[PDB]
Write a sequence for this structure.
């Protein structure tokens, strides 16, 4: 009965997108469990392996950091061999979303790169039909970082959340 | 009641994979409509826009040519604005497959690059869970080109065909 | 003494970018040979294999068609086995550029996908440092298609042309 | 006078590749500074920002973890805004390398995904001309993990190291 909305956020932009996507999910006929991951070294409650194992589907979100997802997120996925092994996530639908400092700061490629692990877990990936890209939702935040979630972005975040939920519905 | 198995093949390697994938589809509870595309300039029956519009799901296959799909295939997709526009393929599951001259001649990247258009058409993409990659089926054919479809490759082609069909089944 | 500026264009948007990139090249200390490819089925002079073989470096441009380059371009590259074989382009610098109907219509991914063949030919690829992306130049043309080349886009086209030329200069 | 050979390794496979690449570099007319990164949570000396700032070129290596680089590596790159900002690495050549548990466990895509940050730093990327792929060196280590670096893999690691060094030489 839930879609996991899993994300990392440093200055709140991705956190905001997560919340909007969650709402999409709810109007897709599903409950949204929004969870984040702890910072690493040498907004929301923390995710555990259970949240992943028992989700019906998943939205994965990160700020774009040099064309890839953020390392606290990567670190969380890095701990999922067990799920890989017994093969959960297999068959469950998934979508990604990202926040960016420039208009063309490589969201598409960050979204691309984030679809990869989900394909390793054998999930079913989907984007947005016909920020915001065909691969998932993106938000543009400016060098400033303060630019708030605009009209179409917020709308697209919800569309994705919804589509994800309905897909999880269809698959039963 | 059909999955479209759409491919281009020049010396038969991809044609063979198409046939094996078709069989997977049949054992997934669906009929396989195998279709190819005509060579361009300046194995199977030709595909038409109808085959695409009315499929329940789709397998797309091409030999890897410099990291991308073959241009006769690309040319066929290039003619699908109309479907894009009214938004068919939207919601329907899809998977890719490729044939290669070397072990690591970039199948993954060709498969990647082929998933892109399907995401532009708003399809749901899936690979192989836990040649053959997590992104779709690949066959290794050698510089020679004669190396035939091996045991695990043939098995993986069928798995994909099947998974595709069952997914299309689940989505109803 | 020349950089090949090789592109396909259907309604002139990419043709325009090619010209702007050519100018960048000239101010990089090199002559720009701008060439296109003939349409296929079943702006500039046509490119031949000689243009490729004897260039010092290369800019490759196409409209984004479903996340990939256009099939007339692909068809031209499809005819370069011979060069692949004897290994020209090996060592020579390359960059890409693309034109798009939407803001986030997948330029990055089209640019990505276009870098792939150049890597198969063993070229050295470069983007834009610190439309327009880090992977190459993009132009946004609108659903309309009439939106002309804007200030920063035109500037970025030239930067790339220049950087390409200077790199080819450095490599000697 | 040095190429930075920067990598993360957990069970030594990537560490081995780093060493072989280093040797390639030396025979390319350059000194190889091999450096790793510390594990994160919530083989070689550690890299510092200085190693990056003052390298003439760079090889980046990681085990493939779900289609992406390892999070300790990502975390190190995650700390390079400053270099991004003042624009070092800009103009310097770069190549990647990866180690994998399966034959087609997505090295190409991991290599791809690793080229992305280097393009954000405005480096010049190169692969292998005409494991081992056109995008960089890969090693196959088996589910076991014990499979040692084979003949052609070891040879390809050196080729890349060498090509990288010579390129850095040419650029001066
Ligand atoms: C080290 C790091 C790398 C970044 N790399 C990029 C990038 O390559 N392209 C871009 O547009 N923005 C980049 N940014 C900006 C972030 O994407 C931006 O801060 C993000 O929208 C904030 O997300 P958050 O508020 O959820 O933490 C980077 C930021 C950091 C801290
Ligand atoms: C122009 C062209 C480009 C090719 N590029 C690659 C490549 O980059 N990597 C590779 O491993 N094989 C490459 N090949 C080999 C084909 O992938 C191989 O012939 C394929 O398996 C045959 O597929 P088919 O029999 O269905 O036509 C290329 C072949 C042609 C004709
Ligand atoms: C069949 C085809 C596919 C296209 N696919 C996309 C696409 O996926 N994303 C996008 O933004 N625009 C897409 N477009 C719009 C083109 O990218 C746009 O027309 C381009 O800027 C024109 O380039 P040209 O004038 O050089 O021919 C497509 C156009 C055609 C004809
Ligand atoms: C969590 C994690 C994720 C992994 N993901 C993949 C993968 O998707 N594909 C693959 O072939 N191997 C995968 N592996 C295997 C590693 O790539 C393999 O252990 C690597 O060759 C070891 O590198 P190292 O000895 O330098 O640490 C993964 C291993 C770990 C620990």
């Amino acid at each position: 009965p839930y879609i996991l909305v899993l994300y990392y956020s440093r200055h709140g932009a991705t956190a905001e997108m997560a919340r909007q996507i969650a709402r999409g999910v709810e109007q897709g006929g599903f409950e949204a469990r929004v969870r984040t991951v702890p910072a690493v070294s040498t907004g929301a409650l923390y995710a555990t392996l259970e949240d992943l194992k028992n989700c019906a589907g998943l939205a994965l979100g990160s700020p774009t950091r040099f064309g890839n997802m953020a390392s606290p997120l990567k670190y969380f996925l890095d701990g999922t061999s067990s799920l890989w092994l017994t093969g959960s996530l297999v068959g469950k639908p998934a979508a990604v979303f990202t926040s960016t400092a420039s208009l063309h700061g490589g969201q598409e490629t960050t979204q691309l790169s984030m679809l990869l692990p989900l394909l390793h877990h054998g999930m079913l990936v989907l984007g947005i039909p016909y920020g915001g890209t065909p691969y998932g939702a993106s938000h543009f935040a400016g060098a400033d970082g303060k630019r708030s979630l605009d009209e179409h972005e917020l709308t697209l975040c919800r569309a994705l959340g919804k589509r994800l939920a309905e897909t999880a519905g269809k698959l039963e």
Observations:
- Chain C touches chain D at residues 84-85, 87, 90-91, 93, 112, 119-120, 122, 124-130, 134-135, 167, 170-172 (CB under 8 Å).
- Chain C has one domain: 1-172.
- The two ends of chain C are 10 Å apart (CA to CA).
